[PDB]
């Protein structure tokens, strides 16, 4: 009585024996269990789901019910009392560039997406959710506390719809509810190529036999490509400025236009693919378009893996890196590659790294124009600021020369996200990412803070004094206890992010364990890991060792001055070097 999955919403895929290249869906990576890590399957559960009724109802759904004998605090109340702050001065990370934040979002999007329950034409219950703040079915509104300023301005709630789940879409099938991961669990550049064959096809340039991805036909960046537009309305990107009427971009991941620096990063990756495909055709004129595309794709996937494991993870996990992610020793087909449900909350540590402004810089790394520095909230689903206001180069220079926000126990999430989030269905710059994260936590039936501390072999504080000690902060611990009553009830997103950061890292002990375990698994459990014997040639592996994010920029923009270590904080001109001194990727090993 151990049915291995709800297998009804996805037919089994037949596994080719040759398999030189990944599937788009992630099927067939694991030859013994082919759907493992594939898109459109349940997130893995590392611990059993915890719901109010044991099955699907989130904690907080029913008033009179409790969690462990106490009511759970309103998501927005926790946001207001713990997560918010006013003063941006002094909040920046002195040793992480803004690219550090941005790379995190890119990696996250490659790994996991649990999209809301849109079903079909549910615009009658959707408006009913927004309009009337009415809890039922997949409508789980974020209600404002008394004295919330947004009561004066926005009504009684923020609308919120439950995440999609496996087996039934409207009703229920009698296991605990399991949310779906709509993208591949492998770190594979699915955010560039898509996780479904339909989108993967749509994204490619099949008109020419050159293995290119489709590029914008309406605009270009001083001769360089943009992503194609998504030609389907409504377009939230058109809505935010109905004069410019610039649509959202079309990328391998639907979230690509959520903010302008994400759209930028997607643009770099797209350009890199086509640059690769062109170079490969030069070396191998006999290669057809399928070949050129797959070979370029495979390279780009290795680029993302190397940047992530070699440059990013060490400076997230700090002294904990080697504990959870020891030197690679090859593919292990016993490893579970699936993204866990908890990871999709753990990796939202990035939310506390996002600063309140974004800058455009000129070739002297000085403010670009009179509106050089923009408030982050103006840039949600904003593509017109790229198309009609200077292309990506000024934004890429900002990514290099400006800093991430530093997580701070007293200054957690900038008001640009916590009060001014724009959601692609709604009309206002009035949402709260923090409140949404907490509501989502409960939506997904997450075990509480202490359950995960136990999973990670860490102490489980039961009293105010114990929590004070773990968080190394008396005031924060006191405020959490006032809202949550027991640490057992603290939502993992807020409890994990509240912990002081490990040495040389940017997350605390609990998050290091959850993140570190997940990344270990997605490396060891991936048959197409770049360094796995058999995937690349030895010569190819030696060339790949040379990649850098600096080189990506040099190759794919009109920027010619770059730092050597792009994720640290770098000041111009002292830490910048000429591109012509930065190692390029040698594609000679790819000549057949
Ligand atoms: C300006 C920057 C960003 C914005 C506007 C943004 C916005 C969002 C929004 C609206 C969601 C969906 C929330 C929900 O409905 O539950 C989300 C989810 C998420 N964000 Fe961010 N985010 C940003 C930056 C980042 C960064 C820097 C990271 C990581 C380093 C990150 C990691 C995630 C993850 C892992 C999820 C959950 C994805 C899933 O499995 O569905 N985000 N973000
Ligand atoms: C090098 C090349 O083929 N560029 C073409 C151009 O010649 C043609 O006018 C257009 C048709 O869509 O596509 C682009
Ligand atoms: C494409 C376009 O029309 N650009 C205009 C720009 O010329 C003008 O200086 C600015 C005023 O803020 O508004 C922009 O929308
Ligand atoms: C900044 O970060 C990098 C990566 O952790 C590290 O090697 C370097 O020594 C750091 N420099 C400072 C300012 O401490
Ligand atoms: C496809 O590539 C050809 C060149 O081979 C080019 O003419 C055309 O503009 C490209 N199409 C798209 C949509 O990128
Ligand atoms: C591979 O993975 C399994 C399950 O995690 C583990 O028990 C086993 O020891 C691993 N084998 C190697 C060689 O690492
Ligand atoms: Br998003
Ligand atoms: Ca992926
Ligand atoms: Cl989004």
């Amino acid at each position: 009585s151990w049915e291995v999955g709800c297998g009804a919403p996805v037919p089994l895929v037949k596994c080719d024996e040759n398999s030189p290249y990944r599937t788009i869906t992630g099927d067939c990576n694991n030859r013994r269990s082919p759907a493992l890590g594939a898109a459109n399957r349940a997130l893995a559960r590392w611990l059993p789901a915890e719901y109010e009724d044991g099955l699907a109802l989130p904690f907080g759904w029913t008033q009179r019910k409790t969690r462990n004998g106490f009511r759970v605090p309103l998501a927005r109340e926790v946001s207001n009392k713990i997560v918010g702050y006013l003063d941006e001065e002094g909040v920046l990370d002195q040793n992480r560039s803004l690219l550090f934040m941005q790379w995190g979002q890119i990696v996250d999007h490659d790994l996991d997406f649990a999209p809301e329950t849109e079903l079909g034409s549910n615009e009658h219950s959707k408006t009913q959710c927004e309009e009337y703040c009415i809890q039922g079915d997949n409508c789980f509104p974020i209600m404002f506390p008394k004295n919330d300023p947004k009561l004066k301005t926005q009504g009684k709630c923020m609308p919120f719809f439950r995440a999609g789940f496996v087996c039934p879409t409207p009703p229920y099938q009698s296991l605990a509810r399991e949310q779906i991961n709509a993208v591949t669990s492998f770190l594979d550049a699915s955010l560039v190529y898509g996780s479904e064959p339909s989108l993967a096809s749509r994204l490619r340039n099949l008109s020419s036999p050159l293995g290119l991805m489709a590029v914008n036909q309406e605009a270009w960046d001083h001769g360089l490509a943009y992503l194609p537009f998504n030609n389907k309305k409504p377009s939230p990107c058109e809505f935010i400025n109905t004069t410019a009427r610039v649509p959202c971009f079309l990328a391998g991941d639907f979230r690509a236009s959520e903010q302008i620096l994400l759209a930028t990063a997607h643009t770099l990756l797209l350009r890199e693919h086509n640059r690769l495909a062109r170079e490969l055709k030069k070396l191998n004129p006999h290669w057809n378009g399928e070949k050129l595309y797959q070979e370029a794709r495979k390279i780009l996937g290795a680029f993302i893996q190397i940047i992530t494991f070699r440059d990013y993870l060490p400076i997230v996990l700090g002294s904990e890196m080697q504990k959870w992610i020891p030197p690679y020793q090859g593919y292990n087909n016993s490893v579970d590659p699936r993204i866990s449900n908890v990871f999709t909350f753990a990796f939202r540590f990035g939310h506390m790294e996002v600063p309140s402004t974004v800058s455009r810089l000129d070739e002297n790394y000085q403010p670009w124009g009179p509106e050089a520095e923009l408030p982050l909230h103006t840039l949600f689903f904003n593509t017109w600021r790229i198309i009609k206001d200077g292309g990506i180069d000024p934004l890429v220079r900002g990514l290099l020369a400006k800093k991430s926000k530093l997580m701070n126990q007293d200054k957690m999430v900038t008001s640009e996200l916590r009060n001014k989030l724009f959601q692609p269905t709604h009309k206002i710059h009035g949402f709260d990412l923090a409140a949404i994260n907490l509501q989502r936590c409960r939506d997904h039936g997450m075990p509480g803070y202490n359950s995960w501390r136990g999973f990670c072999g860490l102490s489980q504080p039961k009293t105010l004094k114990g929590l004070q000690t773990v968080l190394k902060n008396k005031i924060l611990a006191k405020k959490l206890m006032d809202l949550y009553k027991t640490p057992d009830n603290i939502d993992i997103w807020i409890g994990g992010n509240a912990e002081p950061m490990v040495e040389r890292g940017r997350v605390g002990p609990l998050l290091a364990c959850l993140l570190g375990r997940q990344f270990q698994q997605i490396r060891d459990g991936d048959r197409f890991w770049w360094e796995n014997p058999g995937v690349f040639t030895e010569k190819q592996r030696d060339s790949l060792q040379k990649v850098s994010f600096s080189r990506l920029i040099c190759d794919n923009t009109h920027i010619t001055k770059v730092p050597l270590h792009a994720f640290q904080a770098n000041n111009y001109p002292h830490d910048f070097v000429d591109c012509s001194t930065v190692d390029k990727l040698d594609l000679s090993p790819w000549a057949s």
Side-chain angles (χ1 to χ4, degrees), residues 8 16 226 236 288 406 436 448 456 522 552 572:
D16 156 59
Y226 290 124
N288 52 272
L406 183 73
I436 289 159
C456 285
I522 77 103
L552 181 79
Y572 178 88

Side-chain angles (χ1 to χ4, degrees), residues 43 75 83 100-101 103-109 111-116 142 160-164 179-182 255 258 312 316 339-354 405-408 411-414 417 421 423 432-446 491-498 501 506-508 510-512 514-516 518-519:
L43 288 159
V83 186
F100 175 64
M101 176 280 292
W103 191 255
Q105 192 178 27
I106 280 295
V107 168
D108 178 295
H109 287 187
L111 298 181
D112 48 279
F113 186 28
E116 311 171 1
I142 298 165
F160 177 104
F161 303 93
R162 292 196 67 186
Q179 293 72 33
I180 288 161
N181 190 359
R255 299 167 283 183
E258 179 270 346
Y312 176 71
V316 174
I339 301 297
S340 65
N341 209 310
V342 70
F343 177 84
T344 76
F345 301 102
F347 208 169
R348 300 178 197 214
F349 75 83
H351 299 170
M352 294 188 189
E353 296 172 350
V354 179
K405 175 182 167 309
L406 183 73
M407 166 54 182
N408 184 314
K411 293 182 182 177
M412 283 193 184
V413 176
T414 180
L417 287 173
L421 180 72
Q423 293 272 253
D432 180 344
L433 184 55
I436 289 159
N437 286 340
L438 289 165
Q439 199 86 331
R440 194 69 72 194
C441 234
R442 299 164 189 179
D443 178 24
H444 287 222
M446 280 293 107
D491 305 285
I492 188 47
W493 177 75
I494 189 59
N497 283 300
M501 298 167 171
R506 286 296 182 267
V507 294
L510 178 53
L511 295 184
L514 302 171
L515 295 167
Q518 184 76 67
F519 279 112

Side-chain angles (χ1 to χ4, degrees), residues 400-411:
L400 292 173
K402 295 299 183 181
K403 291 165 170 67
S404 287
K405 175 182 167 309
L406 183 73
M407 166 54 182
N408 184 314
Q409 293 174 320
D410 296 336
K411 293 182 182 177

